[PDB]
Amino acid sequence: DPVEVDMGRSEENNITQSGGTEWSKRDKSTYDPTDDIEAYALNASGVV
Amino acid sequence: TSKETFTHYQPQGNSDPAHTATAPGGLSAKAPAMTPLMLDTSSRKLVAWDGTTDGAAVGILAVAADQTSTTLTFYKSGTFRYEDVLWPEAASDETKKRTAFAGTAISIV
Amino acid sequence: TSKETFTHYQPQGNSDPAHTATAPGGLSAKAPAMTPLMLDTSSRKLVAWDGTTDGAAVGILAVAADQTSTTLTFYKSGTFRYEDVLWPEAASDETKKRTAFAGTAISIV
Numbered sequence: 001d002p003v004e005v006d007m008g009r010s011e012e013n014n015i016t017q018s019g020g021t022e023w024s025k026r027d028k029s030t031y032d033p034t035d036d037i038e039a040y041a042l043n044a045s046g047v048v
Numbered sequence: 049t050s051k052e053t054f055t056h057y058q059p060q061g062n063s064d065p066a067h068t069a070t071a072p073g074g075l076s077a078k079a080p081a082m083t084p085l086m087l088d089t090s091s092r093k094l095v096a097w098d099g100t101t102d103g104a105a106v107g108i109l110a111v112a113a114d115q116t117s118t119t120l121t122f123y124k125s126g127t128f129r130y131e132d133v134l135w136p137e138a139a140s141d142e143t144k145k146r147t148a149f150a151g152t153a154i155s156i157v
Numbered sequence: 158t159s160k161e162t163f164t165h166y167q168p169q170g171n172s173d174p175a176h177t178a179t180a181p182g183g184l185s186a187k188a189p190a191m192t193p194l195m196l197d198t199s200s201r202k203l204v205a206w207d208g209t210t211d212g213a214a215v216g217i218l219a220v221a222a223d224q225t226s227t228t229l230t231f232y233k234s235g236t237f238r239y240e241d242v243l244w245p246e247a248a249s250d251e252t253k254k255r256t257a258f259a260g261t262a263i264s265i266v
Binding site: 003004005006 | 049051
């Protein structure tokens with residue numbers, strides 16, 4: 001019988017690169033991914 | 049799977065003391081606690097507040113009662129919450145709902 | 158004073174084995190497990206038994222399924238307690254409900 005397991009994952013923890021500037025549209029020579037990394041990591045509810 | 053929230057029941061929103069009082073009632077339909085009350089213009093008994101007449105609100109129900117309940121107790125004093133008190137559907141304006149218990153010892157917050 | 162009692166479920170009647178087979182499922186509505194089923198005439202599909210088509214019983218559901226469940230399992234053999242099997246309201250004649258599994262490895266008890 002099918003069952004569901006919903007741990008309670010808030011949508012802020014399932015971010016997707018959807019949008020016109022995900023990572024490839026940005027120039028690799030000019031862009032710094034660490035800003036995206038920390039922007040995603042700020043809502044982590046703990047040290048990653 | 050199932051998600052039931054364990055929330056505290058908080059009828060009072062202020063430290064002001066609340067006091068109970070007994071009175072005759074003319075309740076017409078089954079009504080749970082935290083029901084607004086009013087006096088019948090003719091029989092002078094207690095019934096559920098219409099939500100229409102201005103200033104007719106007098107008190108809030110203490111314990112649920114039926115039609116056969118000749119005597120009922122209700123809060124004559126205290127402050128309650130705008131959300132934990134059930135209301136007649138007639139009282140639609142938020143301002144009217146807030147100020148329905150004006151001029152007495154029953155207050156809303 | 159909730160008198161919920163306590164009764165164990167023993168769908169098996171005797172030591173006969175409750176062998177299970179799996180076939181495509183096309184039940185139109187949501188039904189729980191342990192429901193009787195019949196074979197369709199149009200597309201040899203499987204739906205829960207109507208309770209009116211005589212001798213139509215073929216299988217007895219094992220796991221609860223629904224419309225999206227394209228395939229389902231069902232017991233093949235054994236003895237099931239009449240009080241322990243739910244039935245469609247269509248069949249009311251007790252003898253016919255008992256004999257609904259005549260000639261099959263499924264038997265009533």
